[model samples]
Target chain A: LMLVINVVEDKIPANVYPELVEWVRDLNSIREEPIKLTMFVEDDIVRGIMAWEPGHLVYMVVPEESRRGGVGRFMLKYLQQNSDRKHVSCRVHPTNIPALGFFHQQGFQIDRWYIAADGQRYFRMTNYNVISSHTPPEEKLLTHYAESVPIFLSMAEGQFV
Target chain B: LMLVINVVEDKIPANVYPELVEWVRDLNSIREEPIKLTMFVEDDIVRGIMAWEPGHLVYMVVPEESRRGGVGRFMLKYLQQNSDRKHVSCRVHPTNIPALGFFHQQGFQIDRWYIAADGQRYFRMTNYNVISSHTPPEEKLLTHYAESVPIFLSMAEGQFV
Candidate 1:
């Protein structure tokens, strides 16, 4: 499970991607229950894998060598096309600028900043259509808050576009 | 489950807190599985609840009125005292300065900014002891990267600390 994750260790910071062996190992423990963890294989090697719970993505990792080759895009598009839920969302590490660009290019919009129970900060990006079609009222308020509230606006604007 | 969350809607921005009702409702669907969701109740009124998987906290919520009392503090302390894991961690929204201060007061340190799988930005805070004991080598590299690598450092320092 961590074979690809370990291969990309240098691309991800030690602090950002620490305890890979344990974390990935632990992910296997939850495979059949809540999150469905799936992998993408090309030529019989795991190129990428994503863990998701219905509409939300839990984690996605692709080794450096396998990146920039459309593995990520393919997986995301697969999620979007196959999910039964009305929306799909994922969080990206703020320092992974390339990922932010990748999601944005895939039609995800920065929705908000979320503080997880684990004390990890993530930028919540949702499918553009999901926000527009399902929660227009709430999205309006978020947009207003993002534009009018200096604190939130600055936080949103600083890292994201 | 959402009893406490509904009470604090006013304190959290409408934009920020919107969709939580549905979100909390979704938690029930995952209840008997990978994560254990626990609630803190006082005098028959729900004060707060936390969802966790072993060492990592996934979510926690205490309403505005229930806060400033000891509900949040008690729950965290309880987790620390009981968990077998060496360290505990949680993510915090940057704009939620009060929560940040509260966690800091409880001995958590801002370790890094995490972009969640949901596309939300958060400050990943870990038990202070965890930060110190686990990552001297990694911290050195992070500090060096922040000081030397302009792009990575800007992203790291700007959002994290």
Candidate 2:
């Protein structure tokens, strides 16, 4: 059961250029460390995916079409085994009940809750191994928040826009 | 009694230019909205101050020298009345017991909690008028989380530059 996770070292191919560009552009704007996306595919058809940022932590995206077939759980476990670092952390939207349940089933604990740019809420979760390895037990945990520029405009105008 | 709160509006000279400059510079980088700042001064000495971005708010600082005599309360009430929007929010270190009490006295509620980069626990609070205006009785109200990149780095790495 070997799964494909590509590591980009040079120029991205022309076929996937647009997605590559968007991914890089989005990643560039966030506060996290720079990311390296692992495109999970099979027989040249993209089935699932994951992105990592040098450390053991990663973001995996399993499209609606291919979810529930064990691809997500498989990639998670694979990343756990392969990465050199001892921990991994990721966030799942609170409204995303299924994803929240999935990570919980994997022994990840909800550390805190946060609001995303789109007004969606999420829980920041970390496995005990991940939390204990890099982040100290005594280390303080905090919820992160981000807002789109439009939210500020509404605030300035004194009403929801 | 008219409590007149006004923006310095680029034309008015800030008598304490050095302090004002430092304060504004600190505020400019904060990731919050409606970045309105109100400074309370008596005889050219800044006695108290409040900084807020409409939807998300920050701390109110009253010089240790001006703790009594109701200076802090006067400024806070003045800011609330003059606010173009309904809500004003802030984060206070839980250890800062006095600030917690002062905000509570003004009808601000403890909507959330988290840890700071320096490992300090913090409580997030907001004025009732602000929170009520945005959320209905049954609906979930989103609580805002805030972080200063410089503050995080400075505390974590021990040096910003």
State which candidate has the highest TM-score. 2
User: What does the lDDT read for residue A9 in candidate 1?
Assistant: 23
Candidate 2 has a TM-score of 0.36
TM-score of every candidate relative to the true structure? 0.33, 0.36
User: Which DockQ values do the candidates obtain, in the order shown?
Assistant: 0.02, 0.03
The sequence of per-residue lDDT tens digits that candidate 2 reaches over residues A1-161 is: 34464545245443434445455556657845556656555443445556665434445666566778887787787677765554567765433434556776676756666777966556577775433213222111100001100111112234554
Instruction: Report lDDT (Cα) of residue A102, candidate 2.
Output: 71
Residue B117 of candidate 1: its Cα lDDT?
92
What TM-score does chain B get in every candidate? 0.57, 0.56
- How well does candidate 1 score on lDDT at residue A8? 32
lDDT string, candidate 1, A75-146, tens digits: 776676656654688776443445556776677766676567966556778875544312223224323332
Question: Candidate 1's residue-wise lDDT over B4-104, tens digit each?
Answer: 22223234454554554345346446665444545555444556666665567666666555778888887787677656654778876644445556777
Query: Looking at the true structure's interface, with contacts defined as alpha carbon pairs within 8 Å between chains A and B, what fraction does model 1 recover?
Result: 0.00
**What is the lDDT for B81 in model 1?**
68
